[PDB]
Amino acid sequence: SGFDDPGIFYSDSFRKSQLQRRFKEFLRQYRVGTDRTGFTFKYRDELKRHYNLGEYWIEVEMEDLASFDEDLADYLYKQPAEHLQLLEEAAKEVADEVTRPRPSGEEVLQDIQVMLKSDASPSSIRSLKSDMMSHLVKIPGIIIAASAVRAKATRISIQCRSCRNTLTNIAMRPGLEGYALPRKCNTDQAGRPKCPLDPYFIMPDKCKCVDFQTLKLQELPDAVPHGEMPRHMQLYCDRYLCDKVVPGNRVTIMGIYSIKKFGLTTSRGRDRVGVGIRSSYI
Amino acid sequence: LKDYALEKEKVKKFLQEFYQDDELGKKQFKYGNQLVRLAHREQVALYVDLDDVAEDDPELVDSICENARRYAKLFADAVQELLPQYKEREVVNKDVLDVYIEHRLMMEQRSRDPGMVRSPQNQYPAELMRRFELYFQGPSSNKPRVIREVRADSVGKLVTVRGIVTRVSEVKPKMVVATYTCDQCGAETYQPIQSPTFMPLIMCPSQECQTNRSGGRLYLQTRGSRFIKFQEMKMQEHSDQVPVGNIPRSITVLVEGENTRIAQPGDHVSVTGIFLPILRTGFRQVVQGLLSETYLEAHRIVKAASIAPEIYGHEDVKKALLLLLVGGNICLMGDPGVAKSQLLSYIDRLAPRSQYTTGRGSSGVGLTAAVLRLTLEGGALVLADQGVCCIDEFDKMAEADRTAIHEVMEQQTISIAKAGILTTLNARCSILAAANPPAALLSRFDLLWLIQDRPDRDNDLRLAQHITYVHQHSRQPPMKLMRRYIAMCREKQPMVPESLADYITAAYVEMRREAWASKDATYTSARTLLAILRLSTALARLRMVDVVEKEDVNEAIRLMEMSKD
Amino acid sequence: AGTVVLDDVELREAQRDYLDFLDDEEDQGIYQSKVRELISDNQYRLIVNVNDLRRKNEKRANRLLNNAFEELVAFQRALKDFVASIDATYAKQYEEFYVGLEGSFGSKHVSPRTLTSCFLSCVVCVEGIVTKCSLVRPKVVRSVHYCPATKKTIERRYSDLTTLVAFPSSSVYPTKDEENNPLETEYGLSVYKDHQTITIQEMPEKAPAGQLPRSVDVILDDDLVDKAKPGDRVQVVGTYRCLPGKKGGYTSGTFRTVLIACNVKQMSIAKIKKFSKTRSKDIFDQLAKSLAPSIHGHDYVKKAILCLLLGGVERDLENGSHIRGDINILLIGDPSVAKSQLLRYVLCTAPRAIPTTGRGSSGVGLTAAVTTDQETGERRLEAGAMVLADRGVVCIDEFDKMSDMDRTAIHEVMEQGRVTIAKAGIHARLNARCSVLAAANPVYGRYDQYKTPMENIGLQDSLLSRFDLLFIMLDQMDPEQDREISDHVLRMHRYRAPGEQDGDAMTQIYEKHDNLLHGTKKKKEKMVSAAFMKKYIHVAKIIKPVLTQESATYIAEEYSRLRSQDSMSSDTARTSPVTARTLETLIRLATAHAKARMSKTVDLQDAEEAVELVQYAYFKK
Amino acid sequence: AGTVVLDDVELREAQRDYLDFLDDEEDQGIYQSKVRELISDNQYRLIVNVNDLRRKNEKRANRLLNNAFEELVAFQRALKDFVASIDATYAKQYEEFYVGLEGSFGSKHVSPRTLTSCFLSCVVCVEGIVTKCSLVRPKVVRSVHYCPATKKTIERRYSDLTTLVAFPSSSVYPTKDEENNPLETEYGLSVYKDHQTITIQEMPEKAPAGQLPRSVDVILDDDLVDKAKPGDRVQVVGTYRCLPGKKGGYTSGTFRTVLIACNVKQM
DNA sequence: GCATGCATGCGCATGCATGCATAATGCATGCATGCGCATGCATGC
DNA sequence: GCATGCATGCGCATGCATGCATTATGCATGCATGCGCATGCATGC
Ligand SMILES: Nc1ncnc2c1ncn2[C@@H]1O[C@H](COP(=O)(O)OP(=O)(O)O)[C@@H](O)[C@H]1O
Numbered sequence A: 001s002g003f004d005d006p007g008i009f010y011s012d013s014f015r016k017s018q019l020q021r022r023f024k025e026f027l028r029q030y031r032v033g034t035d036r037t038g039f040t041f042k043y044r045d046e047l048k049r050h051y052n053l054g055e056y057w058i059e060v061e062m063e064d065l066a067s068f069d070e071d072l073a074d075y076l077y078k079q080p081a082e083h084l085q086l087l088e089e090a091a092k093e094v095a096d097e098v099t100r101p102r103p104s105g106e107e108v109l110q111d112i113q114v115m116l117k118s119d120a121s122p123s124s125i126r127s128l129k130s131d132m133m134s135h136l137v138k139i140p141g142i143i144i145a146a147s148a149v150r151a152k153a154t155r156i157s158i159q160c161r162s163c164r165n166t167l168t169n170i171a172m173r174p175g176l177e178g179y180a181l182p183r184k185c186n187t188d189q190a191g192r193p194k195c196p197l198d199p200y201f202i203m204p205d206k207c208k209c210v211d212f213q214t215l216k217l218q219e220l221p222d223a224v225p226h227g228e229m230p231r232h233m234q235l236y237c238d239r240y241l242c243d244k245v246v247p248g249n250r251v252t253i254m255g256i257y258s259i260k261k262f263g264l265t266t267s268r269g270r271d272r273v274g275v276g277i278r279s280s281y282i
Numbered sequence B: 001l002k003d004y005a006l007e008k009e010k011v012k013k014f015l016q017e018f019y020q021d022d023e024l025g026k027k028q029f030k031y032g033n034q035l036v037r038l039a040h041r042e043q044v045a046l047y048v049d050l051d052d053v054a055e056d057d058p059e060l061v062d063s064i065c066e067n068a069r070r071y072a073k074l075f076a077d078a079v080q081e082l083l084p085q086y087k088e089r090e091v092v093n094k095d096v097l098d099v100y101i102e103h104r105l106m107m108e109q110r111s112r113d114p115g116m117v118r119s120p121q122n123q124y125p126a127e128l129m130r131r132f133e134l135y136f137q138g139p140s141s142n143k144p145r146v147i148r149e150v151r152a153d154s155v156g157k158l159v160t161v162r163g164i165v166t167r168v169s170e171v172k173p174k175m176v177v178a179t180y181t182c183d184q185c186g187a188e189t190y191q192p193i194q195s196p197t198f199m200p201l202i203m204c205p206s207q208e209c210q211t212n213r214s215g216g217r218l219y220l221q222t223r224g225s226r227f228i229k230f231q232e233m234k235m236q237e238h239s240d241q242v243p244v245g246n247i248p249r250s251i252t253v254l255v256e257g258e259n260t261r262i263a264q265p266g267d268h269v270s271v272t273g274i275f276l277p278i279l280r281t282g283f284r285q286v287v288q289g290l291l292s293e294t295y296l297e298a299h300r301i302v303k304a305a306s307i308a309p310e311i312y313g314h315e316d317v318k319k320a321l322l323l324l325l326v327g328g329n330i331c332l333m334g335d336p337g338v339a340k341s342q343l344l345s346y347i348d349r350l351a352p353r354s355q356y357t358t359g360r361g362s363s364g365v366g367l368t369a370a371v372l373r374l375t376l377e378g379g380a381l382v383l384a385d386q387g388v389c390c391i392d393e394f395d396k397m398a399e400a401d402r403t404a405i406h407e408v409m410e411q412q413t414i415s416i417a418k419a420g421i422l423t424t425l426n427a428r429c430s431i432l433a434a435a436n437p438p439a440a441l442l443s444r445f446d447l448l449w450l451i452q453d454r455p456d457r458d459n460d461l462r463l464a465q466h467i468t469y470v471h472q473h474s475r476q477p478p479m480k481l482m483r484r485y486i487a488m489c490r491e492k493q494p495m496v497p498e499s500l501a502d503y504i505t506a507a508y509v510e511m512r513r514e515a516w517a518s519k520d521a522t523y524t525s526a527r528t529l530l531a532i533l534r535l536s537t538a539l540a541r542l543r544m545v546d547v548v549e550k551e552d553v554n555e556a557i558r559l560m561e562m563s564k565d
Numbered sequence C: 001a002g003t004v005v006l007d008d009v010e011l012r013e014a015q016r017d018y019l020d021f022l023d024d025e026e027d028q029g030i031y032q033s034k035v036r037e038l039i040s041d042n043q044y045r046l047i048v049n050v051n052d053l054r055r056k057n058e059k060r061a062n063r064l065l066n067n068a069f070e071e072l073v074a075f076q077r078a079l080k081d082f083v084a085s086i087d088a089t090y091a092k093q094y095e096e097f098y099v100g101l102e103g104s105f106g107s108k109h110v111s112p113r114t115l116t117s118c119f120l121s122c123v124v125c126v127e128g129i130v131t132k133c134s135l136v137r138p139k140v141v142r143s144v145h146y147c148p149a150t151k152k153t154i155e156r157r158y159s160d161l162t163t164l165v166a167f168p169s170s171s172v173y174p175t176k177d178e179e180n181n182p183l184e185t186e187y188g189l190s191v192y193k194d195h196q197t198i199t200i201q202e203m204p205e206k207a208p209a210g211q212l213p214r215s216v217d218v219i220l221d222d223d224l225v226d227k228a229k230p231g232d233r234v235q236v237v238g239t240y241r242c243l244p245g246k247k248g249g250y251t252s253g254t255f256r257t258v259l260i261a262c263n264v265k266q267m268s269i270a271k272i273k274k275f276s277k278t279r280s281k282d283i284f285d286q287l288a289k290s291l292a293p294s295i296h297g298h299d300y301v302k303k304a305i306l307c308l309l310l311g312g313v314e315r316d317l318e319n320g321s322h323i324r325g326d327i328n329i330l331l332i333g334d335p336s337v338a339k340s341q342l343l344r345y346v347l348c349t350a351p352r353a354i355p356t357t358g359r360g361s362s363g364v365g366l367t368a369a370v371t372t373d374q375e376t377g378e379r380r381l382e383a384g385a386m387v388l389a390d391r392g393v394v395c396i397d398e399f400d401k402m403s404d405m406d407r408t409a410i411h412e413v414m415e416q417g418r419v420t421i422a423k424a425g426i427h428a429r430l431n432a433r434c435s436v437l438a439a440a441n442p443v444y445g446r447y448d449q450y451k452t453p454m455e456n457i458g459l460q461d462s463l464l465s466r467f468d469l470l471f472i473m474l475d476q477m478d479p480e481q482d483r484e485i486s487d488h489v490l491r492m493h494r495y496r497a498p499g500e501q502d503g504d505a506m507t508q509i510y511e512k513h514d515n516l517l518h519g520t521k522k523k524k525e526k527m528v529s530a531a532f533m534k535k536y537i538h539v540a541k542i543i544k545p546v547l548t549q550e551s552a553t554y555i556a557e558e559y560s561r562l563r564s565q566d567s568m569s570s571d572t573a574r575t576s577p578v579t580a581r582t583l584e585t586l587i588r589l590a591t592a593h594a595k596a597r598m599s600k601t602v603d604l605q606d607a608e609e610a611v612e613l614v615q616y617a618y619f620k621k
Numbered sequence D: 001a002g003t004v005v006l007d008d009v010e011l012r013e014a015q016r017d018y019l020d021f022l023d024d025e026e027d028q029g030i031y032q033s034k035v036r037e038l039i040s041d042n043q044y045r046l047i048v049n050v051n052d053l054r055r056k057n058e059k060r061a062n063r064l065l066n067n068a069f070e071e072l073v074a075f076q077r078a079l080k081d082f083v084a085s086i087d088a089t090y091a092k093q094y095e096e097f098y099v100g101l102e103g104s105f106g107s108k109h110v111s112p113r114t115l116t117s118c119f120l121s122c123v124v125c126v127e128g129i130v131t132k133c134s135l136v137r138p139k140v141v142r143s144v145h146y147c148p149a150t151k152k153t154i155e156r157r158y159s160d161l162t163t164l165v166a167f168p169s170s171s172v173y174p175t176k177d178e179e180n181n182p183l184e185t186e187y188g189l190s191v192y193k194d195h196q197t198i199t200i201q202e203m204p205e206k207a208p209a210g211q212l213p214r215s216v217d218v219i220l221d222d223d224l225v226d227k228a229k230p231g232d233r234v235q236v237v238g239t240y241r242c243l244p245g246k247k248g249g250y251t252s253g254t255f256r257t258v259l260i261a262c263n264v265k266q267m
Numbered sequence E: 001g002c003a004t005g006c007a008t009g010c011g012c013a014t015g016c017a018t019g020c021a022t023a024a025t026g027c028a029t030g031c032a033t034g035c036g037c038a039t040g041c042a043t044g045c
Numbered sequence F: 001g002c003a004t005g006c007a008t009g010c011g012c013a014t015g016c017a018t019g020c021a022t023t024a025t026g027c028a029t030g031c032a033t034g035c036g037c038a039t040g041c042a043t044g045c
């Protein structure tokens, strides 16, 4: 009849998905104990208790995962960005499995932050060079500055000027990365006149927000070379990692070595010697 | 406005309630039996009467009348929910579509745990698994409307119309829901259709393809798709309802699965339908805004004794007309002023399948058939197939029409070979013709009746008295039964025994001998014997006898003698 | 848009002026009863005389003619106010009411050829013929949608031609919720209005000879959808505006001009009761005598024409049988016996009269035709002369020159009154109930007395039986008859219209006596006025008489007597054969005479008059 | 915009619930005398105990604490209805009335250091000291103009923070007629409302020793303009919302969070 | 009381996140009408 | 009645006015803070 639009539907199906399934089985199966006294389900019970108490975070030791299956542990050491997402989805699915009979009304299943911990000996901050980009590194230091906690968006929704149509549930990228709005209104309009150029506005009240913090880390005075100025580093903290460190503490931090991504902006200032340099962080 | 849940519950209880009506004189659970049959493939569509609902709640009926489509969907969902309760056994024999439905339900039970979260897009479309259709019957209190007066006030309502059929479309499948398979996954994608045209999809919305970001591409399938039977109908007003000096108006109807193949061109029909628009996108127009075209969606389509007692006299001609109607070609030639046209009009009105032509108005393309945007549409001779055709002022027709009529009478098929048309048409119809005062009529036709106006005083006075009675009291001096009697009569087929042949043979020979004695006689041939045999068989059929008898042969001989004299 | 207006002197004053215009309390105005009639009839528009407005308030009329849209808006607001005042309940049904216009516009009375840009944005009047029409289409005004996901219903309002210029923000159909939940359209709750487009051409009679015609395009709104049809002569009053083209960068600077109609017009008790009850027979006596003073003598033809004007009675029965009720006449005479004058007078007097000479119209243009529409590929029906003249009169001059096939075609109309049409793809039965006048010259130029009428007429018996009456007229050169004819002709010639100076270039029941048009001797009698004659004819045509038992046997016996006298008439020949149609003709003429004098039943005198007519017409010396 | 809403179960039910909450006929409630006091004092806002609402209707309190804006709108509508009911004459003066909140919020009692994105779009309570204040500035709500050329007056309505997101079509000051005749602004007939901005810091007595302080920014509307001064210890209850940045192509994805006060208390 | 220390205080430079300003051309579609063809109607002789 | 004339009628090509579709990058401005300077206050001896 040319008026309605019922949409699109699909049905459940009859290698990354297999990786997520492997992580889920690891979480549901892992146990620690003895043959004499049996074994206890470490991560299952831990996730159950944390979700029940309201703490949306768990900590995973890489040695346990390597014991369970070395392939996934080796994978996490090389491409943390994707396998972290897969492991978080597996943790969310397990938490849904264990705590199905929740109190009424609170049906919404929230995300879960997965932290990492290992017994590997650290390495000097001076060893950070080009070869370690996008890998997982462990570094000691002393914290000297900590900015205020701010808000950063993970899901956004935008509206059109003329026809007031909406694009919803757009996923933002983690880290210090931006987003560019589209310029064309994607609506089929025949006979109707069309929308202008650049018609989109960001709706603030319909976005998902998380905590955000930046830290300044200095090389340990115990390991600074004689007669050399100490070096510094900038750290990114998200969600539950905020407020865990006070300036002046001596900390060991495991993270990913990255660069900021805010587009191909032109260099500024009266000095323009450097070409193709992106500010780095962890 | 009222919540749909309460009315859905009311619909369910109404379907579960009624016990009242039974044909055999009892109290029978009708809707329960209908639902039990619906559980398996013993019934593939259900019709709901809005007169039975009126007993308990008329506001439901009014809301159904004004908002018919929403209530149709609600009824469909309610019946689908009720179906599992009434089911008692698995299908004894099932076809391809049932095999898909069973397999999909089985794997849905296999995979989906009761507690896992399911996206609103992850469900099956309602109409894909459904295999039964619901239609409504117009209220008896509701008065049928006229094609001319349905307007914007009637868009979206439930209406009942009566009209004449002029155009019918051949059956073709119509898409309901399209099924897609991804290039790199086992998932299935469903696309509902509610538009005259649609744009096929490309990428796969399945969860696995999304998680892997594989970029798999969809492909259509025809086996998994759902198709329905679709037909297009054209209707016109009766000549009675047209105002002064105007022309009949037309409307367009769409016809669904079981309602398909009910109506034929030239039939008078009553249609219960919903009046809905179609959004039109195309050539630019003068006035801005949203215009639309209207059309009708159907849910139900519904289609010796005295012959012309108003006309005085011609009793033997009336008997011959009765025999022609009953069956096993009659021509009348008369002076002007004798009502020959009115007999043909009565014959046209009485016959189930009939056509009536007046002369050059229906000449040429009005007969035979022609090609129109391509489909071939027939004329009066084609429409009257297996019926009776009536032609007035036969002698004034063009020669081509007369040749076509002769071909229909003798060969019973039409052959057309012209630029763009090369066909043979089946016309198994008997012809009644009228004319004014030739060897062609005697040789080709079976029975000729010559009506000569001899001015006898007594006959003229009686005719005047009868006409005055008709004009004054509007009724003759002291059809459904006739139609039923003819229908019952035509069911049987008598047979000719071996012995009577000799008698018949003798008669024929003697008749021809007399015709050879009277040199003024014109025609006797085996065609006359065939006509006599056919008339005797028709009379035996009237008596419902298995074996031809003597009285039928005598009456046929007497009728032929009266016609010839 | 939050912009609002607080004060406007002109609009408020104009609204006040219309409020005072439509009060009708201290005046003899009628508009109050008009509004009450509109409420009674459920209609929602009014027609107001422009001359009346100018008489009451000339400035408002000047402003309305010079400026249309704002003044029309003020009119509609005032109508809403007064409809609410008289009955606020009825005003709830309709959004806004409308105003029609009527009266002599004067200078603005403009032909389709003389419409110019000088009259833009004003109200104009135009007279023309209709050539193109389009199918009726609905248009959305208010839309309603429902969301099964959230159980919420919303409504959107549309206003496209209400505002002069529209923008892409409006006229957008909603399909999705704020959270992308699908919406289901609910057609029952929406609001639609009908729309049609027609084309009008300057009438060929008015256009200068040898020049191509010019046309205007008209848009018909919801109320005026079915008020026009192709091939019709109409007068349209409405606004003349420009058409906004759709968005673009470069424009040539040429707009399209479209007339938006507001009014469409099809151009056209005690006294009667007393006169009828007192006169009875004298009713038809005077009506026959006073039929046309311009024509001398011929009482029988005047009686027959009056019988056509009154006519018979259409009858139907249980079996669907139809019985004809119309009358048909054929006149044959020598030249200069004023047959064409009679035809022209019947054209002038009869309500629906169409003249169609012998070779002027062919068989296709008489009844109807079927044409394949190139725009859609469908088949459409075009009505001919006889279908247009339903329950009317068709006059055929020079009937003898008509071809045989056309007469065979006319047979269908003359016998049953219907036309059957069929071509592969469509078939119909159109109504064509009608009456026919025909005048035909004799074959030998002048009627031969010695030869029998059959040789002179030269027509078959079937066609003669189709006609109810045959009349033969002769120019006998009697000196006294010639003197009378000369007196009458020169009296009519010397007459001049009263109120017109000599030498210049160029209602009472009974007409005032005239010295020349009537004469000194005729002072003892009077003639009936034309207007009362038309009113009485219409009233008589409405009346439905019934046949009595006294006259049926009498008429049947006389029909048998005629069919036996067929052998007795030895001294004279017969003009027309006697068939079964003669009895129906007798009954029809009896009923026509019973219509002439308003009563309830058919009496013996009407039968006697019918039989006198039949005897006179059917035999000649 | 011609779009309208016909039915909404949640909003209508919430309005009915507040109507029953503020009746005080068959109960020992006091809000009727509070409304009479407000009418007597020409003030146009009310303060309602959160604990009282939770005791009478726990579900409404839960929804209001978890979702602020819609529930506050329903409160304001109910106040308008009851002010019209008791005395319709007084309700003519003001466009819409406002609601304050009071009582023990419990878990939502939050220090400026512990405000997080978890409490966004909810009503929060904060205790702090005032450090920065700004001058009071008027803001236009309804504008009125006059045309000496045509002797016509027009009025334009403005609504910026009433709606979550604003567009360039609105917030445009008219200066010319449809035929380019100049318009003269008439400041007497227009409508303005006052506006102020303050900053609140966590009290040094409460902050952990040796750590830098953290602060929040507050916007004070027309009624609460003069209720705060620098160097003062206050408690503020109000909504915690994001701030819409002006139009642009590329966004970094970091919003600004601003607390919009509804109640300010001098402890 | 005079000599000295010094926590407070002020004005102009650069660095960096947000924010502001710019801005016709080419290609597609439906309406009007010519040109070849076959059917069919009407008109003579 | 048969032979001929012919006004009507239909389908596919091109020509021409309106109408439709497309579409990121570079430069400017205000907030934060270092560095040199002079006044002035407070603290000793
Ligand atoms: N036997 C009859 N009985 C009654 N009416 C008759 C009879 N014969 C003729 N008529 C009347 O005479 C009229 C004959 O006209 P019609 O039947 O058209 O003649 P035809 O068919 O020869 O052209 C009809 O209207 C009919 O009413």
Ligand SMILES: Nc1ncnc2c1ncn2[C@@H]1O[C@H](COP(=O)(O)OP(=O)(O)O)[C@@H](O)[C@H]1O
Pocket (backbone or CB within 6 Å): C294, C295, C296, C297, C334, C335, C336, C337, C338, C339, C340, C341, C488, C489
């Ligand atoms: N009876 C009459 N009375 C008056 N005028 C007559 C009469 N008969 C003939 N005429 C005159 O003779 C003329 C006849 O012309 P017309 O009616 O064309 O004759 P026809 O129609 O016979 O060819 C008319 O102009 C009319 O004035």
Ligand SMILES: [Mg+2]
Pocket (backbone or CB within 6 Å): B340, B341, B392, C415
């Ligand atoms: Mg006939």
Ligand SMILES: [Mg+2]
Pocket (backbone or CB within 6 Å): C339, C340
């Ligand atoms: Mg004449």
Ligand SMILES: [Zn+2]
Pocket (backbone or CB within 6 Å): A160, A161, A162, A163, A164, A165, A185, A187, A195, A199
């Ligand atoms: Zn848009």
Ligand SMILES: [Zn+2]
Pocket (backbone or CB within 6 Å): B181, B182, B183, B184, B185, B186, B187, B204, B205, B206, B209, B216
């Ligand atoms: Zn797939």
